[PDB]
Nucleic acid binder design. Structure first.
Lengths: 211, 95, 49, 147, 68
RNA sequence: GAUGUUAGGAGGGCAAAUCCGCCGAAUUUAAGCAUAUAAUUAAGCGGAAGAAAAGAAAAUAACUAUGAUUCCUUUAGUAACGGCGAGUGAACAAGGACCAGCUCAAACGGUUAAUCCUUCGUUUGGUGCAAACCUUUCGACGGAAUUGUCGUUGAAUUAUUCCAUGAAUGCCUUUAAUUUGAGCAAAGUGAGCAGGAAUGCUUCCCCAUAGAGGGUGAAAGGCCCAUAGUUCUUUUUAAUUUAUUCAUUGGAAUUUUUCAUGUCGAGUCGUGUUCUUUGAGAUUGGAGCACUAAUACGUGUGAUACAUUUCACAUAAAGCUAAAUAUA
RNA sequence: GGCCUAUCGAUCCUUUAUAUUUGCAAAAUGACGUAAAUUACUUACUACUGUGCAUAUAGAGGUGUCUGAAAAGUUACCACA
């Protein structure tokens, strides 16, 4: 070690030559993934191969304002839509048991999303030319003419993608509706100060309730 | 920090019941089998000692029993549960 | 020995790459530069052809 | 790369450009950070002052999401609008902009700089400094605490 | 697995496959799941899950790309 | 329980890169060395597959909450460990790739185990030249199985709606891909010069969707093979086309209304103690020994020992499972 | 502090002092305290709020090879740089 330069810190000390791997494969691997998935989509009778997913709000403090694709619509959301899980599963709507709709807005938003997908889709009669009403709340089958014309149409995949949050921060308010007597900083610090005593009371209420 | 499931959260970011402002949403066979098992099998040896301590029925004897139970099962939680359960049996049998 | 893990490639920068393309096309535009680059371009009517 | 290297400039010279008299021997002090506190102590004192020992409270899992919170000073606040919008507010007194500090990904508003005197502004954010509240109030604006 | 009753039954069938020879010698019994720490999930068992060696190997694994 | 050259079957060994169990060092680093370090490495020994392992919550969070597993990008050289020296060192979120769920056991079903299997047989097919394979229902006679196989997945019951079903006559067309072998395959062997012999040099001709590569007596698009290009044929699998009548048994999903509010893996978890191992710190996982539980208002997590208690999240101590992913 | 010139000790660690300074990671432990309030998961309002462990600050426990490894001999049997 010599003069001003930062302290050395390289963790290659335990044997590392026997442990490199260099990816020369990037473009070819990417090409391969694309080609298989495209082949699969081609194989699957002109159907989409993508499955529907619920939009969910991200975990914790860090991403509280952001929203992403989750995993699995829940039973409440399916029921609200008018579907039952196995039936939903067949038409590519993905299930889970784990999620639970904590707050109202998320349930309403997801049932609208399910409904929009449901209303969009048109169903192939299973054994050809034998169209029926069908089970589980799955959309009823359709004739030859509608299907033929629809197959010729482009299948628009926009619903599968994540919902853009439309920015609305550049917004306007009249000056004479502003309320200038408020003290936000004071309220905040006082609230932090008073937290333990509020917890103490809440705990007492919780005890009272349980008996 | 604790939340409240009624009186929905304040819109501020900190202090009690805080956060974003969205509207929050909301035995017979067992006894029979246990009774049959008890008739077949009786108490544990340690349980017999515990019964005698409870039967003595004093603060020193009960305190000793609680400590003994804690030693035998490990931990307070298990020991307390067992002491209460045996004590209940002793009262019921004495009755 | 020469290993498999020499620093083979380089991450050339998007804005620079774009500029290089624009500038190269622009250079092709100029008659003197194409001629200088050594093409036998003497009888051509116009260099942006 | 290789053709420019220093050794080629010195190519026939016995030391390889690395001292005839003492010569370049292997590992000449001992490995890495070894000489700290002892024979290279003077370097450690003179280049990394505070380095040795422990100080302060331990924290068993940081879980860094909890404590995340980017800052912005009030100074930059009008700059989050485009130019044309700002001019329009300067012209028209009756309306003022609200600014939701969350959409641009900042959490706490701090007090550096000077705001334009007598443009009110409504500031929506998770956190504020004491100074920031006073400044925002001074120009006739309001602070709204918001999750 | 060389007798019909296990081969026919759609239940339990899997054990006839060639890939389940010697489960007890490989840590693929309930005891096996136990000493590998596969019984307890969550943060508490941390590094065990894809196999202890495998996890160590992934953490050590030093990775480069063509352009860096 | 033995015994059988009884009848049918199976395991042994070779191969190891990736892959899974064990068992397990030291040189080394620290300018010495004893803890650490080297390293949960090497050697040793066992076991698999075309990938394996993992996997369907005794998870994380503390949010507006997420939601099987793996991998990538990352957090992060950070929280943390450490003669707090040398050095070592995670997890959650987030962006992606991929995206798949499940069944035993437990409960419930006795005017009848509704199961399962060997051997003997017996028939509706289809391919194939043949060999042969491939579908196909139907009985025997043994056994096995209540020391528990099978069905069901609380229980009936309403309306709605589906799925298997069996017979008759009919009908297997056009295309698109995809992948094999297949063919066919453009113009100069023109002067003159020097040379053993041009593919050289001139010069006069040309072809190219072929001027890739190779061969040929010196550098050849036109000398040859091949090449570009197509024409077939092979693999499978899409789309398209035609079903229509009649037939009965059986099953499924919601929906009403009732009535039942049931179950949930023990010398195991846990605890003490040891030793080991770790990011794990008054113990991270494992392991030995000693002690040894509770029943779902239970008991397990919520990374500092504890008591007295909230609340959130989960349902341990049984099993399986494609993908991405790895390959000296 | 000793008429002046000498009279001495890093990190970790321990130890005991200091504070209207702090932590123990989803929470609580003074205290249902003080007012109200109704019969309740009620509303305000209070610098002082369990045990144990940890920090921060300040001394002290010692390194005399005294800018700080926890370390005895022998080889005429010996090896190597």
């Amino acid at each position: 070690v010599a003069h001003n330069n930062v302290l050395p810190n390289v963790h290659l000390h335990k044997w590392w030559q026997h442990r490199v791997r260099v990816n020369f494969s990037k473009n070819i691997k990417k090409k391969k993934r694309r080609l298989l998935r495209e082949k699969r989509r081609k194989a699957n009778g002109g159907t989409p191969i993508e499955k529907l997913h619920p939009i969910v709000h991200c975990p914790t403090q860090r991403y509280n304002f952001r929203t992403r694709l989750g995993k699995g619509f829940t039973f409440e959301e399916l029921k609200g839509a008018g579907l039952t899980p196995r039936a939903a599963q067949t038409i590519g709507i993905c299930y889970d048991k784990r999620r639970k709709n904590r707050s109202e807005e998320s349930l309403t938003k997801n049932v609208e999303r399910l409904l929009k997908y449901k209303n969009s889709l048109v169903m192939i009669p299973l054994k050809k030319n034998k169209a029926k009403k069908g089970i589980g709340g799955i959309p009823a089958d359709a004739d030859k003419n509608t299907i033929k014309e629809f197959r010729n149409k482009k299948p628009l995949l926009s619903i599968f993608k994540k919902e853009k949050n439309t920015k609305p921060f550049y917004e306007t308010i009249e000056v004479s509706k502003i309320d200038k007597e408020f003290l936000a900083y004071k309220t905040l610090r006082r609230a932090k100060l008073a937290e333990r005593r509020k917890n103490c009371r809440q705990q007492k209420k919780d005890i009272k309730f349980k008996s | 920090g604790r939340k409240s499931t009624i009186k929905p959260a304040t819109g501020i970011a900190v202090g009690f019941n805080s956060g974003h402002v969205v509207t929050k949403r909301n035995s017979k066979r067992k006894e029979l089998i246990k009774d049959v098992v008890r008739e077949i099998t009786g108490f544990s040896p340690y349980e017999k000692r515990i019964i005698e301590l409870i039967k003595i029925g004093t603060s020193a004897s009960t305190k000793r029993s609680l400590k003994y139970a804690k030693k035998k099962l490990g931990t307070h939680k298990r020991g307390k549960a067992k002491r209460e359960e045996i004590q209940k049996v002793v009262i019921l049998q004495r009755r | 020995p020469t290993k498999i893990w020499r620093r083979w490639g380089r991450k050339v920068n998007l804005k620079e790459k774009r500029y290089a393309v624009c500038s190269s096309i622009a250079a092709s535009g100029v008659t003197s530069l194409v001629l200088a680059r050594g093409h036998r371009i003497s009888h051509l009517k116009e260099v942006p052809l | 790369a290789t053709r420019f290297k220093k050794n080629r400039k010195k190519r026939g010279h016995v030391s390889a450009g690395h001292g005839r008299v003492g010569k370049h021997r292997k590992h000449p002090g001992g490995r890495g950070k070894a000489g700290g506190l002892h024979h290279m102590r003077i370097n450690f004192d003179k280049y990394h002052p505070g380095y040795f020992g422990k100080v302060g409270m331990r924290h068993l899992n940081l879980l860094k999401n909890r404590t995340y919170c980017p800052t912005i000073n009030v100074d930059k606040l009008w700059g989050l609008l485009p130019e044309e919008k700002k001019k329009e507010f300067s012209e028209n007194k009756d309306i003022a902009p609200v600014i939701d500090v969350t959409r641009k990904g900042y959490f706490k508003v701090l007090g550096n700089g000077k705001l334009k005197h007598n443009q009110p502004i409504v500031v929506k954010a998770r956190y504020f400094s004491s100074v920031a509240e006073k400044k925002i109030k001074a120009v006739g604006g309001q602070c709204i605490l918001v999750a | 697995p060389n007798h019909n009753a296990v081969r026919n039954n759609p239940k339990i069938n899997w054990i006839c496959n060639p890939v389940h020879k010697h489960r007890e010698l490989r840590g693929l019994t309930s005891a096996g799941k136990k000493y590998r720490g596969l019984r307890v999930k969550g943060h508490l068992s941390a590094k065990s899950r894809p196999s202890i060696r495998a996890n160590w190997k992934r953490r050590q694994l030093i990775k480069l790309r063509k352009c860096r």
